[PDB]
Design a protein around this motif. Structure first.
Motif, PDB file in Angstrom:
ATOM      1  N   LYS A  82      -5.269  12.425  23.727  1.00  0.00           N
ATOM      2  CA  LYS A  82      -6.207  11.265  23.191  1.00  0.00           C
ATOM      3  C   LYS A  82      -6.335  10.564  24.418  1.00  0.00           C
ATOM      4  N   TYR A  83      -7.491   9.667  24.510  1.00  0.00           N
ATOM      5  CA  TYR A  83      -7.823   8.835  25.656  1.00  0.00           C
ATOM      6  C   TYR A  83      -8.378   7.286  25.112  1.00  0.00           C
ATOM      7  N   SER A  84      -7.394   6.457  25.482  1.00  0.00           N
ATOM      8  CA  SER A  84      -8.066   5.105  25.160  1.00  0.00           C
ATOM      9  C   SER A  84      -8.607   4.665  26.420  1.00  0.00           C
ATOM     10  N   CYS A  85      -9.235   3.526  26.374  1.00  0.00           N
ATOM     11  CA  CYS A  85      -9.871   3.117  27.609  1.00  0.00           C
ATOM     12  C   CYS A  85      -9.651   1.432  27.705  1.00  0.00           C
ATOM     13  N   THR A  86      -9.605   0.900  28.981  1.00  0.00           N
ATOM     14  CA  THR A  86      -9.375  -0.596  29.278  1.00  0.00           C
ATOM     15  C   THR A  86     -10.773  -0.999  28.536  1.00  0.00           C
ATOM     16  N   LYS A  87     -10.346  -2.426  28.022  1.00  0.00           N
ATOM     17  CA  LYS A  87     -11.416  -2.912  27.410  1.00  0.00           C
ATOM     18  C   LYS A  87     -13.005  -3.482  28.045  1.00  0.00           C
ATOM     19  N   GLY A  88     -13.892  -3.200  27.324  1.00  0.00           N
ATOM     20  CA  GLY A  88     -15.386  -3.007  27.981  1.00  0.00           C
ATOM     21  C   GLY A  88     -15.462  -1.696  28.530  1.00  0.00           C
ATOM     22  N   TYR A  89     -14.773  -0.698  28.209  1.00  0.00           N
ATOM     23  CA  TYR A  89     -14.895   0.718  28.591  1.00  0.00           C
ATOM     24  C   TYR A  89     -14.848   1.667  27.518  1.00  0.00           C
ATOM     25  N   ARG A  90     -15.763   2.545  27.129  1.00  0.00           N
ATOM     26  CA  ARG A  90     -15.487   3.427  26.088  1.00  0.00           C
ATOM     27  C   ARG A  90     -15.527   4.887  26.787  1.00  0.00           C
ATOM     28  N   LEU A  91     -15.455   5.648  25.842  1.00  0.00           N
ATOM     29  CA  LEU A  91     -15.320   7.158  26.329  1.00  0.00           C
ATOM     30  C   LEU A  91     -16.831   7.653  26.023  1.00  0.00           C
ATOM     31  N   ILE A  92     -17.055   8.117  27.133  1.00  0.00           N
ATOM     32  CA  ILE A  92     -18.308   9.153  27.421  1.00  0.00           C
ATOM     33  C   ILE A  92     -18.433  10.392  26.509  1.00  0.00           C
ATOM     34  N   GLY A  93     -17.603  11.116  26.463  1.00  0.00           N
ATOM     35  CA  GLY A  93     -17.555  12.454  25.675  1.00  0.00           C
ATOM     36  C   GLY A  93     -16.748  12.445  24.717  1.00  0.00           C
ATOM     37  N   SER A  94     -15.536  12.838  24.509  1.00  0.00           N
ATOM     38  CA  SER A  94     -14.799  12.906  23.058  1.00  0.00           C
ATOM     39  C   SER A  94     -13.256  12.405  23.494  1.00  0.00           C
ATOM     40  N   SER A  95     -12.954  11.277  22.866  1.00  0.00           N
ATOM     41  CA  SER A  95     -11.825  10.817  23.191  1.00  0.00           C
ATOM     42  C   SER A  95     -10.568  11.458  23.071  1.00  0.00           C
ATOM     43  N   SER A  96     -10.589  12.403  22.379  1.00  0.00           N
ATOM     44  CA  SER A  96      -9.507  13.578  22.119  1.00  0.00           C
ATOM     45  C   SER A  96     -10.228  14.864  22.379  1.00  0.00           C
ATOM     46  N   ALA A  97      -9.487  15.729  22.931  1.00  0.00           N
ATOM     47  CA  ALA A  97      -9.930  16.998  23.274  1.00  0.00           C
ATOM     48  C   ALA A  97      -9.203  18.004  22.604  1.00  0.00           C
ATOM     49  N   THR A  98      -9.863  19.161  22.522  1.00  0.00           N
ATOM     50  CA  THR A  98      -8.956  20.415  21.770  1.00  0.00           C
ATOM     51  C   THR A  98      -9.008  21.359  22.796  1.00  0.00           C
ATOM     52  N   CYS A  99      -8.100  22.084  23.277  1.00  0.00           N
ATOM     53  CA  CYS A  99      -8.056  23.044  24.088  1.00  0.00           C
ATOM     54  C   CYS A  99      -8.601  24.430  23.368  1.00  0.00           C
ATOM     55  N   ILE A 100      -9.284  25.123  24.228  1.00  0.00           N
ATOM     56  CA  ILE A 100     -10.258  26.238  23.597  1.00  0.00           C
ATOM     57  C   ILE A 100     -10.182  27.129  24.862  1.00  0.00           C
ATOM     58  N   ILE A 101     -10.859  28.401  24.680  1.00  0.00           N
ATOM     59  CA  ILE A 101     -11.294  29.305  25.739  1.00  0.00           C
ATOM     60  C   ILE A 101     -12.715  29.496  25.543  1.00  0.00           C
ATOM     61  N   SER A 102     -13.209  29.276  26.613  1.00  0.00           N
ATOM     62  CA  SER A 102     -14.544  29.467  27.142  1.00  0.00           C
ATOM     63  C   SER A 102     -15.183  31.049  26.872  1.00  0.00           C
ATOM     64  N   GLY A 103     -14.201  31.668  26.980  1.00  0.00           N
ATOM     65  CA  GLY A 103     -14.569  33.349  27.254  1.00  0.00           C
ATOM     66  C   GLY A 103     -13.282  33.961  27.725  1.00  0.00           C
ATOM     67  N   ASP A 104     -13.459  33.823  29.022  1.00  0.00           N
ATOM     68  CA  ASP A 104     -12.348  34.424  30.061  1.00  0.00           C
ATOM     69  C   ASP A 104     -10.984  33.684  30.034  1.00  0.00           C
ATOM     70  N   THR A 105     -11.044  32.355  29.826  1.00  0.00           N
ATOM     71  CA  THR A 105      -9.708  31.317  30.174  1.00  0.00           C
ATOM     72  C   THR A 105      -9.914  30.378  29.306  1.00  0.00           C
ATOM     73  N   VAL A 106      -8.629  29.771  29.124  1.00  0.00           N
ATOM     74  CA  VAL A 106      -8.415  28.205  28.301  1.00  0.00           C
ATOM     75  C   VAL A 106      -8.613  27.187  29.398  1.00  0.00           C
ATOM     76  N   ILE A 107      -9.612  26.488  28.693  1.00  0.00           N
ATOM     77  CA  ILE A 107     -10.126  25.254  29.101  1.00  0.00           C
ATOM     78  C   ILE A 107     -10.189  24.122  28.154  1.00  0.00           C
ATOM     79  N   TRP A 108     -10.477  22.840  28.432  1.00  0.00           N
ATOM     80  CA  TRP A 108     -10.674  21.887  27.369  1.00  0.00           C
ATOM     81  C   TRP A 108     -12.093  21.836  26.790  1.00  0.00           C
ATOM     82  N   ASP A 109     -12.286  21.302  25.442  1.00  0.00           N
ATOM     83  CA  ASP A 109     -13.459  21.543  24.967  1.00  0.00           C
ATOM     84  C   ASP A 109     -14.302  20.163  25.618  1.00  0.00           C
ATOM     85  N   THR A 110     -13.807  19.395  25.722  1.00  0.00           N
ATOM     86  CA  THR A 110     -14.296  17.985  26.316  1.00  0.00           C
ATOM     87  C   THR A 110     -14.324  18.011  27.835  1.00  0.00           C
ATOM     88  N   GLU A 111     -13.356  18.446  28.510  1.00  0.00           N
ATOM     89  CA  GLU A 111     -12.802  18.419  30.009  1.00  0.00           C
ATOM     90  C   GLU A 111     -12.638  16.922  30.179  1.00  0.00           C
TER      91      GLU A 111
END
Length: 132
Positions: free
Chosen positions: A27-56
């Protein structure tokens, strides 16, 4: 298989107490006046070959507050039609139709500014007022 581990925000501790694996989220909160560009929470997945974060992991950027909320009558009054980052302000006014004659009323708070205190990710002082 566990993920790469979450990137470290400045003036922040850790995204997740425990949960860097596929079925776990950071989970990712921000300093006030800032938002999250992508997704404030990320779910760990596999791209194919290896396990990486969906949102990075989102980067807390100053709230773009991009394209002010639309209005019932026709856009808003501001020196800049399209908005830049947080701290900006625009004024909405309800317009005469034919000319002198009023056809519209306004809620009571015509001028809004970026404060992101709504339940949304990060927006203006509120949603565009409406000509009610």
């Amino acid at each position: 298989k566990s993920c790469r581990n979450p990137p470290d925000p400045v003036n922040g501790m850790v995204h997740v107490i425990k949960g860097i694996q596929f079925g776990s989220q950071i989970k990712y909160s921000c300093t006030k006046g800032y938002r999250l560009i992508g997704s404030s929470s990320a779910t760990c997945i596999i791209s194919g070959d290896t396990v990486i974060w969906d949102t990075e992991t989102p980067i807390c950027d100053r709230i773009p507050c991009g394209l002010p909320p639309t209005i019932t009558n026709g856009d808003f009054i501001s020196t800049n039609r399209e908005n830049f980052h947080y701290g900006s302000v625009v004024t909405y006014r309800c317009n005469p139709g034919s000319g002198g004659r009023k056809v519209f009323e306004l809620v009571g708070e015509p001028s809004i500014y970026c404060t992101s205190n709504d339940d949304q990710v990060g927006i203006w002082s509120g949603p565009a007022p409406q000509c009610i």
